[PDB]
Design an enzyme around this catalytic site. Sequence first.
Site, short mmCIF file in Angstrom:
data_model
loop_
_atom_site.label_atom_id
_atom_site.label_comp_id
_atom_site.label_asym_id
_atom_site.label_seq_id
_atom_site.Cartn_x
_atom_site.Cartn_y
_atom_site.Cartn_z
N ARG A 112 13.72 94.01 10.51
CA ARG A 112 13.06 95.17 9.97
C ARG A 112 11.75 95.44 10.69
O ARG A 112 11.14 94.56 11.27
CB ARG A 112 12.77 95.00 8.46
CG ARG A 112 11.80 93.92 8.15
CD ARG A 112 11.96 93.54 6.67
NE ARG A 112 10.91 92.65 6.24
CZ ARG A 112 10.90 91.33 6.40
NH1 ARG A 112 11.91 90.72 7.06
NH2 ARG A 112 9.86 90.59 5.93
N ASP A 127 10.92 76.79 10.84
CA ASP A 127 10.06 77.79 11.49
C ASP A 127 8.89 77.16 12.22
O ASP A 127 8.37 76.10 11.84
CB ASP A 127 9.47 78.77 10.51
CG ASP A 127 10.44 79.72 9.93
OD1 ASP A 127 11.59 79.85 10.33
OD2 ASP A 127 9.96 80.42 9.00
N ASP A 179 9.24 77.81 2.71
CA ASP A 179 9.48 78.45 4.00
C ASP A 179 8.29 78.12 4.89
O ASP A 179 7.51 78.98 5.33
CB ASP A 179 9.66 79.93 3.76
CG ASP A 179 10.10 80.68 4.97
OD1 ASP A 179 10.82 80.07 5.84
OD2 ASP A 179 9.75 81.92 5.00
K LIG Z 1 12.82 78.82 7.45
#
Ligand SMILES: [K+]
Lengths: 162, 162, 162, 162, 162, 162
Positions: free
Chosen positions: F31, F58, F90
């Site tokens: 996006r 990440d 996250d």
């Molecule tokens: K992740």
Amino acid sequence: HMQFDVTIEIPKGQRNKYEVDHETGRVRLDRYLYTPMAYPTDYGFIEDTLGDDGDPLDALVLLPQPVFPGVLVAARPVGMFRMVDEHGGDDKVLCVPAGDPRWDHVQDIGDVPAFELDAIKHFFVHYKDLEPGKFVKAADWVDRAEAEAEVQRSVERFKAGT
Amino acid sequence: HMQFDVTIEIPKGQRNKYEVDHETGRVRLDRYLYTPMAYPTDYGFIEDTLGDDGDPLDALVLLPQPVFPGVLVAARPVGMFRMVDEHGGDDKVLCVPAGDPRWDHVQDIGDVPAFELDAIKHFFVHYKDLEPGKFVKAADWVDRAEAEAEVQRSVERFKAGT
Amino acid sequence: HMQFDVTIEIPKGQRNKYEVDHETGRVRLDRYLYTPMAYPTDYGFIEDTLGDDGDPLDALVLLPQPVFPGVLVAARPVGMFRMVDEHGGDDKVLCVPAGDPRWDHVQDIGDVPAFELDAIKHFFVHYKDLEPGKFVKAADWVDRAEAEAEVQRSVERFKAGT
Amino acid sequence: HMQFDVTIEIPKGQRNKYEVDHETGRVRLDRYLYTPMAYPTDYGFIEDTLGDDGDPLDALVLLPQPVFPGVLVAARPVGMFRMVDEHGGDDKVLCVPAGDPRWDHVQDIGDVPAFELDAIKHFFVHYKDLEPGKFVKAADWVDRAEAEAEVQRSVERFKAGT
Amino acid sequence: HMQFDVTIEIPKGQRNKYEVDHETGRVRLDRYLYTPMAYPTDYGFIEDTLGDDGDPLDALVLLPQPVFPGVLVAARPVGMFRMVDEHGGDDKVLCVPAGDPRWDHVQDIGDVPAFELDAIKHFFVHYKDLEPGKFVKAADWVDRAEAEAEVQRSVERFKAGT
Amino acid sequence: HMQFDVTIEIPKGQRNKYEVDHETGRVRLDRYLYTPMAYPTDYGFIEDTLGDDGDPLDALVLLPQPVFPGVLVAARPVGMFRMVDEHGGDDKVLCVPAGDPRWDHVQDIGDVPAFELDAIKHFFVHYKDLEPGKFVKAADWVDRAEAEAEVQRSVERFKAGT
Ligand SMILES: [K+]
Ligand SMILES: [K+]
Ligand SMILES: [K+]
Ligand SMILES: [K+]
Ligand SMILES: [K+]
Ligand SMILES: [K+]
Ligand SMILES: [K+]
Ligand SMILES: [K+]
Ligand SMILES: [K+]
Ligand SMILES: [K+]
Ligand SMILES: [K+]
Ligand SMILES: [K+]
């Protein structure tokens, strides 16, 4: 009917905060922003205006492609972002290019998508989050008629000062 | 032998049409082009010239890397693009950097590849296709001697006006 | 309801004509365009489609910011540009990002401003002007329903080939 | 305590060598460099200074993001690169943005990593390698106190000339 | 007559040294250069070649506009830069786009201006100046016939390895 | 001692949110962000890791110049940003280039300036402000030892899955 010249200080997408020195016309780097944000539209001020604080009235200009710091763009108002910072009122007139039929569908504040207005508001509400003592509050959108009144009074102040 | 200063208004690759205001020196956005085209060379005008229409004589400058709007480049002519638009003649002097030996192989119009000249012509013939009432016609390339004569007369007009 | 993945080969603003090799997935430079033109929108093709010529169906995607060659974008169709070149039909499906409410106002071809559609058409009509033997003709815009039918048949061809 | 305004002529990463004309303030392209090199930092000069050669004192400014030719930046000195070229001394004051706490860790020349200082030196030692008759020699780094003395004398020269 | 595909790893103007992993095809950042230098041409390697060191033969491609890391360009050789580094020979084939008439004037090494060849040489001679233990020596230009022989032997090595 | 390969999905300064599809390796536009924000560092994931959610771990990589989506960078960890979003943990490992002595001064989280860490935190806390139902909370910085433990467990999960 109303139009004016805007000097763009900061193109869309910049984290460098440029400003024109209103005594000399020179472009200065004020600061690199402290937040991971970038101006959401081309940003500057209306030539031949004077706000109560002694600086010209600020402007945001919607464009298909950004310009360079210092460039003039003939523009017309479609609304205004009212806001206060640590020094009081610091409103921004929202504009589109004057004389350009590609913008004729944008006449007033309801003609700009909420997603765009909300992103503009978000920028000004948050860009100084990490600068001590600086902030933005009392922020909201008003219509073209209100924007034009603000431009007109600032033109009057400018002319009284000459 | 002939050289002059060109102010570049529009770098190669731009769809934003910038122009210098010749009264103030400020850079203005005239318009975003209406066609999906981009200036084929850096484009501007020759300082201290005056065409019959009261504006300086236009110039195209071949460069290895574009400059920024408003930058001066010492240049020498190698030919000219003759053309008319909706307001009459609007010729462009084709130039290379003066004093730069990397350009010494380019002395006259035959030294520029046809592919480059044809792309320049294509730009001016088509860039206003989608602007009502605007056009470009009677367009062709002439040599350095003809370009120099056009520069000289425009220098004479400038000096007569002072 | 219909959506698909588009691989963008060429971002908006490019004069380098990139293409994906459909056997390997590699990005190739086909050519630098011969005209001073630049792709008016991000341009590529619809994954898992096969046109009659054995290549996937081409796509144009409207975006707020361009992507990089090779990037996938989930998209939905809003119309199609019908055209022929020197090899016959070479239509392009016009798309917007799927699942993105900022594009919900664009549902069919009448929701895209004429200035934008006319600039797209101008690009394809003229970009090969200076390439011998190459051209674009019989070019016009059709609606979403027609675009969806073209996508569907090309999906059927793809599946028949597996 | 010492600060001054620097006008950046050349942003970091440029192979175009821009210069401000000190009589008019206009930005000029001096030349495209002849070596495959690019300015290692934003580069320009200190306003309201005069070196012995009649030009302002040169400056290098460390920044998180480059500016545009012609932009002013309030800066403070942290050292100086002493060097001579084909015309004699042509020293550069090394600076950081003034009033910006992100740079408070950089107070003197030992606070700048050797890798950065060595790359700056390499640029000036080599950028004219391929220009006949031009060179850079006797090049080394000195501390803030020495830099400040050089600025002060150049401010004195400027004031004597008014 | 000879042509081949080059994968460009590093576009002109980069200080990031990218490399393709020849086992996987992935693009990797090898390093940011330690000198204030930038690749003078698009740079990469010839697909389906194997040098004696087990890597493909390197290539330089002259282009009007750079590509992106990983892009294929059909190219033909016009000469070669012979050089050695800390690991021995590491020659580069100099190429132009194949099938493009804008390059038909460039057939052999004498058709490339000395200024461009000298800048290429300067890059490779100096870019590792600030890397301990790394260097470039025995560097000179040879003609197309010599370049083609080097390509041919490297194609033979590649085919022997399959 | 610990190092690994990071695939950068999003270069510093992007408002386009790219993601690699972990089944195919293709780069996708997820996006355009809804806020006027831009990634504060190059951002991606560690190859050959698996978090509890089934995606790789990440990573944020500090660099002197950004890379392109899809590029691999050999990196080492110096700390981690712990956070939760609408789907739970996250976290992001903060890294510098491995094998590069210009980064040897950065060994643990206290070696990164607070201004930089605070800007990173600000990005993740605010970038989804204008996306309904999405948020970021419980966000704070931890040290290299904690980051390495998180990498190690994710390497173990990856190996168990093969
Ligand atoms: K992740
Ligand atoms: K104001
Ligand atoms: K604050
Ligand atoms: K004119
Ligand atoms: K027209
Ligand atoms: K097709
Ligand atoms: K044609
Ligand atoms: K000087
Ligand atoms: K020299
Ligand atoms: K090699
Ligand atoms: K070395
Ligand atoms: K939210």
